[PDB]
Design a binder for this molecule. Structure first.
Ligand SMILES: *[C@@H]1O[C@H](CO)[C@@H](O[C@@H]2O[C@H](CO)[C@@H](O[C@@H]3O[C@H](CO)[C@@H](O)[C@H](O[C@H]4O[C@H](CO)[C@@H](O)[C@H](O)[C@@H]4O)[C@@H]3O)[C@H](O)[C@H]2NC(C)=O)[C@H](O)[C@H]1NC(C)=O
Ligand SMILES: *[C@@H]1O[C@H](CO)[C@@H](O[C@@H]2O[C@H](CO)[C@@H](O)[C@H](O)[C@H]2NC(C)=O)[C@H](O)[C@H]1NC(C)=O
Ligand SMILES: *[C@@H]1O[C@H](CO)[C@@H](O[C@@H]2O[C@H](CO)[C@@H](O)[C@H](O)[C@H]2NC(C)=O)[C@H](O)[C@H]1NC(C)=O
Ligand SMILES: *[C@@H]1O[C@H](CO)[C@@H](O[C@@H]2O[C@H](CO)[C@@H](O)[C@H](O)[C@H]2NC(C)=O)[C@H](O)[C@H]1NC(C)=O
Ligand SMILES: *[C@@H]1O[C@H](CO)[C@@H](O[C@@H]2O[C@H](CO)[C@@H](O)[C@H](O)[C@H]2NC(C)=O)[C@H](O)[C@H]1NC(C)=O
Ligand SMILES: *[C@@H]1O[C@H](CO)[C@@H](O[C@@H]2O[C@H](CO)[C@@H](O)[C@H](O)[C@H]2NC(C)=O)[C@H](O)[C@H]1NC(C)=O
Ligand SMILES: *[C@@H]1O[C@H](CO)[C@@H](O)[C@H](O)[C@H]1NC(C)=O
Ligand SMILES: *[C@@H]1O[C@H](CO)[C@@H](O)[C@H](O)[C@H]1NC(C)=O
Ligand SMILES: *[C@@H]1O[C@H](CO)[C@@H](O)[C@H](O)[C@H]1NC(C)=O
Ligand SMILES: *[C@@H]1O[C@H](CO)[C@@H](O)[C@H](O)[C@H]1NC(C)=O
Ligand SMILES: *[C@@H]1O[C@H](CO)[C@@H](O)[C@H](O)[C@H]1NC(C)=O
Ligand SMILES: *[C@@H]1O[C@H](CO)[C@@H](O)[C@H](O)[C@H]1NC(C)=O
Ligand SMILES: *[C@@H]1O[C@H](CO)[C@@H](O)[C@H](O)[C@H]1NC(C)=O
Ligand SMILES: *[C@@H]1O[C@H](CO)[C@@H](O)[C@H](O)[C@H]1NC(C)=O
Ligand SMILES: *[C@@H]1O[C@H](CO)[C@@H](O)[C@H](O)[C@H]1NC(C)=O
Ligand SMILES: *[C@@H]1O[C@H](CO)[C@@H](O)[C@H](O)[C@H]1NC(C)=O
Ligand SMILES: *[C@@H]1O[C@H](CO)[C@@H](O)[C@H](O)[C@H]1NC(C)=O
Lengths: 113, 432, 109, 120, 120, 120
């Protein structure tokens, strides 16, 4: 898949990232998941949304700050609010499915607060 | 050393009597059902497992006998149509029809009893072809004259489904499993406890399952035994497929007194042209949904297995067509327009027939006469699943269906009834 | 809710030698552990799914097994293309009943 | 935790939820007559459990201690293992086949102490 | 001896079978509806006896001793004769007509001792 | 005075009639089926009250004292005023909206004292 968005914002800012399908469409049997990795850290999970019925799951730490949604047959977005310096990280999207991990990963985006 | 504890959180499998909760004298007497507990609390159970078996679940048997008993009680205090089983003299309806309806409706005249015992009247009404049998213009009988009694359904009692919740009595609890990969049997770890289930709509249908619950994680395919060709396969969609059905003719109705205090509702004439009843399904939605079922269905056969949906197997209409109950009418639709593909590596229109004399439970017993309904019927509904049966590189599946103690089986698969046993003992280091 | 700890931190071996990385959990995640390989500058590559199955594109040197709360990733021999950290991902949510890729433990080379 | 919330918990820890389960044990058409069956059943089961506690001298308590010795043949385990590393569902299965033995001992042992009050 | 096995036995000896009788006191066609009548009746009778024991301060016991004096006018016999040379059926007949007297005394005497706990 | 004879009486004085009210709480044609409804209802209500007294550690008593402190916010009155210059109907109205608070406190406070017997 491919990804876009990112940039430098100041604390208190919101930023929306967008990921899109390439060579595929959002048929029912996929999850679009977002993960984060700060420059000195390992992988962190944020949220997943199931294509059929737009069903989402969130990390407790992300609750109330990170909203995940499907906007089209090819596009999934992540809306982040109340951003702080601690949220500076590489953000990634990847596609998974039931019972497994994400197998398709895009190059990530860079968000600096 | 022995300490006796009371209130210990353990249970055994058990069968008990369930009662309903819910929420104009409809067919299931829902006004006689207790009120629901608003915002009931669901309690998740951590670090537990349990085993389930949807094919041995006695909740299905209770729903089966509750619905039948209610059906019969509701039709009991209604006018009998015995005086109507007479020789009919019939001709074809030809004045304003399309070709597809030629021969579908008949205009029948007959000699019927008036409120006075010693007087008779000449009346006529229209009937659908499927309810009329030729004896030898031409003489006819109603289809059930040599088999059963015909009772007219009461015009004030509606049939649309109303959610019914099943509640356990105190001392019992219902275990609901959330495991979204559960195939109907064996261990199902995500267990939570409720006192009463969500509502289930008592929809009666064949081949296609309408207005049920949806799957989420994947399309679920469940059967008692995959390799046993004598068993049905229940397929649960994770997305609805929308259909739109219509009468479409503008009907009128008239009352005939057939004795003191009693009347028969006859089909009157038709306003405007006579056209064939039909159902439409979105084509693209059906095309994509069926492909999802195939991808998942193949997991039990192999990646080199070809899946074909052939056509309906043949037999009586009740088991070959899509039996659909809507608007107070009984439809028998032709599904060969849907199940027509082979999978290797606009709208669809389904012509549909209408019957007024209904043997609802596939038994010989009292038959119901559906009174005519005036105006035009328009139905909108969700296909939530389907029933398939299976017949060396190609597997063939067919709509099959027709079984009772099915359909509801796709709603109750998530629940088990258990009995709470508060007493138990254990050793410790105390004495009196 | 989710506990995942990778324990053999900072393990390395010479080419031709072998390594193993293991994770523990406080909740059973039977057959739902995924392993990933992350080379610097890259998104993680899926290696192993459902505890023991290899993902397409994964070399035969990768293997692993486990059940319950105890799982291990093994390398049959170092080929100098192991310059990555590895991660443990949980693919089962005990509260929702869903099986989606929520939660990581990890960071060992 | 809520009703049966402790079902998967350690036997020792679960003793503090005994109140929660006890609290929830007591309560001519198709949906009509079933309610007399539902209510009569709930009452009879409630009362049978209370009757046994009464007979054994445990009336009014969620936890009661008696003087019947533990026969190790019923379960050859120590106390640390059952109270800290086992749940009640597991324990119930392990000694389910001795239930009738324990109950007979518990009731006889109560009557034997009632005669001892003949002296007060 | 079994249920009512002691019915013909000496009143004293029969006190050791009180457990046996207590244990057996609690539980739209022709053979259908009679079962709601059978079960409701069994429950009401069980509960009325428990209610009286509760009121008199005898809850949880097969044998309870109270502070009501014996009025010899009810039966001019000594203890040796009734406990060793009489059965319970005979005793019940002899003092059956004072049952309501004894019961009124037993309940008043309990409330009189509840007020005495106002000081603790 | 008879059943509810003390209803208009001073709360303190009325405590001596608790026996009288407790004593009277327990028990296919038109006049037929109503009797199963009448009897089942009487039994369930009786048992629910007994169940609460059991849970709070008040089994077998018309009057029971517990260790839950009085929170003056429930009623800012002294004892002389409620026991001597008020009836039970009036008192029940005054604190009716705290019933669920008191009951939760009473049951938790009983289980907290059962664990304390682990040492005897
Ligand atoms: C699957 O679910 C859908 C959605 O609930 C369900 O479709 C609905 O069915 C009802 C009943 O047939 C429709 O309600 C009718 O609407 C018409 C038009 O306004 C009214 O004229 C009707 O009133 C007459 O009939 C009543 C019942 O006998 C009488 O009480 C009344 O006095 C009138 O004589 C009635 O209100 C409703 O409009 C549809 N909804 C949609 C979106 O079409 C569908 O039937 C379910 N599937 C199955 C198999 O049942
Ligand atoms: C069924 O047959 C009846 C009887 O022939 C038809 O009713 C007659 O219609 C004509 C007009 O075309 C009137 O002049 C007559 O008075 C009507 N007779 C009666 C008894 O009502 C009726 O139209 C036919 N129905 C259909 C659908 O063809
Ligand atoms: C057909 O399926 C749709 C989609 O699930 C149903 O619409 C949902 O209804 C629930 C309950 O009222 C709402 O919470 C959702 O927000 C609705 N979803 C959408 C997209 O509108 C619809 O009710 C179903 N039809 C029938 C007859 O069951
Ligand atoms: C499910 O099992 C886990 C252990 O696998 C329990 O976790 C322990 O909880 C106690 C407190 O009750 C802590 O002192 C331990 O340190 C925890 N163990 C570990 C490995 O972290 C968990 O509480 C159990 N769940 C329930 C509802 O009882
Ligand atoms: C029936 O009555 C006889 C006496 O006529 C009882 O026999 C006595 O039993 C006691 C032990 O309980 C012995 O100590 C006496 O010596 C026996 N008496 C004689 C004359 O032998 C007999 O037990 C009674 N039956 C029952 C069931 O109580
Ligand atoms: C009704 O109220 C009157 C007071 O207005 C009560 O009379 C008092 O009774 C007590 C004994 O219980 C005496 O000591 C007082 O001196 C009486 N007061 C007066 C002013 O004479 C009367 O008892 C109440 N009735 C009932 C049934 O409780
Ligand atoms: C009536 O229908 C029959 C078929 O059942 C057909 O043979 C006959 O010709 C039709 N009559 C008229 C007048 O159309
Ligand atoms: C009614 O009875 C008469 C008897 O003479 C018969 O000729 C006529 O055809 C009958 N009519 C109908 C509609 O059955
Ligand atoms: C008469 O009975 C036969 C079966 O013996 C059945 O096929 C036929 O349809 C029946 N006809 C009528 C009018 O009842
Ligand atoms: C359901 O899955 C279990 C394995 O977890 C398997 O043993 C069982 O046969 C499956 N049931 C069906 C109907 O396929
Ligand atoms: C079905 O589709 C046809 C067009 O192909 C349209 O004329 C008809 O009215 C539709 N029927 C329904 C019930 O939507
Ligand atoms: C059913 O009718 C509605 C209008 O009431 C229309 O929006 C919808 O597309 C139709 N569905 C199908 C399958 O034709
Ligand atoms: C629609 O059905 C045809 C077979 O008739 C199949 O080749 C095609 O792939 C299907 N389309 C979708 C979206 O599944
Ligand atoms: C499809 O099934 C129907 C009903 O059994 C049958 O009448 C029709 O001939 C079949 N069509 C084909 C092409 O097999
Ligand atoms: C369904 O339509 C086909 C024509 O495509 C016809 O041959 C078949 O007999 C019809 N099925 C039924 C049950 O009438
Ligand atoms: C099934 O598809 C074929 C074309 O492959 C078509 O000729 C046939 O009429 C279709 N059958 C039905 C019932 O629509
Ligand atoms: C049926 O025809 C009558 C003619 O008077 C008209 O008033 C009514 O609205 C029509 N109904 C429909 C559904 O078209």
């Amino acid at each position: 898949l491919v990804e876009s968005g990112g940039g430098l914002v100041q604390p208190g800012a919101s930023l929306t990232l967008t990921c899109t399908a390439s060579g595929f469409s959002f048929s029912s049997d996929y999850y679009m998941c977002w993960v984060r990795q700060a420059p000195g850290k390992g992988l962190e999970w944020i949220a997943c949304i199931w294509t059929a019925n737009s069903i989402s799951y969130y990390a407790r730490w992300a609750k109330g700050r990170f909203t995940i949604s499907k906007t089209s047959s090819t596009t999934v977005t992540l809306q982040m609010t109340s951003l702080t310096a601690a949220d500076t990280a590489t953000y990634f999207c990847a596609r998974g499915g039931s019972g497994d991990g994400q197998s398709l990963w895009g190059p990530g985006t860079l968000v600096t607060v | 050393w022995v300490t006796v504890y009371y209130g210990v959180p353990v249970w055994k499998d058990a069968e008990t009597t369930l009662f309903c909760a819910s929420d104009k004298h409809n067919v299931w007497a829902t006004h006689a059902c207790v009120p629901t507990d608003p915002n009931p609390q669901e309690i998740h159970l951590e670090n537990v497992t349990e085993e389930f078996n949807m094919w041995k679940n006695n909740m299905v048997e209770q729903m089966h006998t509750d619905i039948i008993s209610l059906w019969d009680q509701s039709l009991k205090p209604c006018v009998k149509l015995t005086p109507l089983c007479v020789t009919l003299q019939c001709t074809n309806v030809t004045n304003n029809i399309t070709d597809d309806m030629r021969g579908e409706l008949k205009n029948c005249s007959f000699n019927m009893t008036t409120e006075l015992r010693d007087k008779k009247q000449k009346v006529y009404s229209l009937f659908y072809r499927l309810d009329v049998v030729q004896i030898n213009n031409k003489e006819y009988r109603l289809i059930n004259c040599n088999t059963s009694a015909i009772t007219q359904a009461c015009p004030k009692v509606s049939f649309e489904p109303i959610p019914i919740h099943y509640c356990a009595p105190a001392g019992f609890a219902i275990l609901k499993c959330k495991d979204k990969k559960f195939n109907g049997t064996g261990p199902c770890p995500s267990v939570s406890t409720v006192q009463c289930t969500h509502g289930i709509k008592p929809v009666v249908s064949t081949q296609l399952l309408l207005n049920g619950s949806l799957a989420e994680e994947e399309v679920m395919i469940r059967s008692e035994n995959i390799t046993n060709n004598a068993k049905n396969i229940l397929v649960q969609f994770n997305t609805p497929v929308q259909i739109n059905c219509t009468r479409p003719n503008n009907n009128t109705r008239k009352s005939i007194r057939i004795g003191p205090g009693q009347a028969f509702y006859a089909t009157g004439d038709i306003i405007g042209d006579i056209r064939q009843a039909h159902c439409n399904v979105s084509k693209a939605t059906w095309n994509e949904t069926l492909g999802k079922v195939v991808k998942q269905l193949r997991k039990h056969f192999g990646n080199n297995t070809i899946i074909r949906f052939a056509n309906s197997s043949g037999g009586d209409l009740e088991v070959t067509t899509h039996s659909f109950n809507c608007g107070g009418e009984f439809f028998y639709c032709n599904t060969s327009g849907l199940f027509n593909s082979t999978w290797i590596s606009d709208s669809i229109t389904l012509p549909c027939r209408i019957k007024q004399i209904i043997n609802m439970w596939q038994r010989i017993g009292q038959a119901m006469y559906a009174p005519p309904i005036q105006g035009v019927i328009r139905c909108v509904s969700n296909i939530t699943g389907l029933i398939l049966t299976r017949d060396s590189t190609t597997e063939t599946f067919r709509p099959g269906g027709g079984d009772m103690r099915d359909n509801w089986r796709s709603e109750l698969y998530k629940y088990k009834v258990v009995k709470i046993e508060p007493l138990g003992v254990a050793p410790t280091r105390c004495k009196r | 809710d989710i506990v995942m700890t990778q324990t053999p931190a900072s393990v390395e071996a010479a080419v031709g030698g072998t390594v193993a990385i293991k994770c523990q959990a406080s909740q059973s995640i039977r057959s739902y552990l995924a392993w990933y390989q992350q080379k610097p500058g890259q998104p993680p590559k899926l290696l192993i799914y459902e505890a023991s199955k290899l993902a397409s594109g994964v070399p035969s040197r990768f293997s692993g097994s486990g059940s319950g709360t105890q799982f291990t990733l093994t390398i049959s021999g170092v080929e100098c293309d192991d310059a990555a950290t590895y991660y443990c991902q949980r693919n089962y949510d005990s509260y929702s009943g869903a099986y989606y890729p929520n939660g990581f433990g990890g960071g060992t080379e | 935790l809520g009703f049966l919330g402790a079902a998967g918990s350690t036997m020792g820890a679960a003793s503090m939820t005994l109140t929660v389960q006890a609290r929830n044990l007591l309560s001519l058409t198709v949906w009509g007559i079933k309610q007399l069956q539902a209510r009569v059943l709930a009452v009879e089961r409630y009362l049978r459990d209370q009757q046994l506690l009464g007979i054994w001298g445990c009336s009014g308590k969620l936890i009661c201690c008696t003087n019947v010795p533990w026969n190790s043949s019923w379960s050859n385990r120590n106390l640390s293992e059952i109270w800290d590393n086992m749940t009640w569902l597991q324990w119930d299965k392990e000694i389910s086949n001795y239930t009738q033995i324990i109950y007979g001992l518990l009731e006889e042992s109560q009557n034997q102490q009632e005669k001892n009050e003949q002296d007060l």
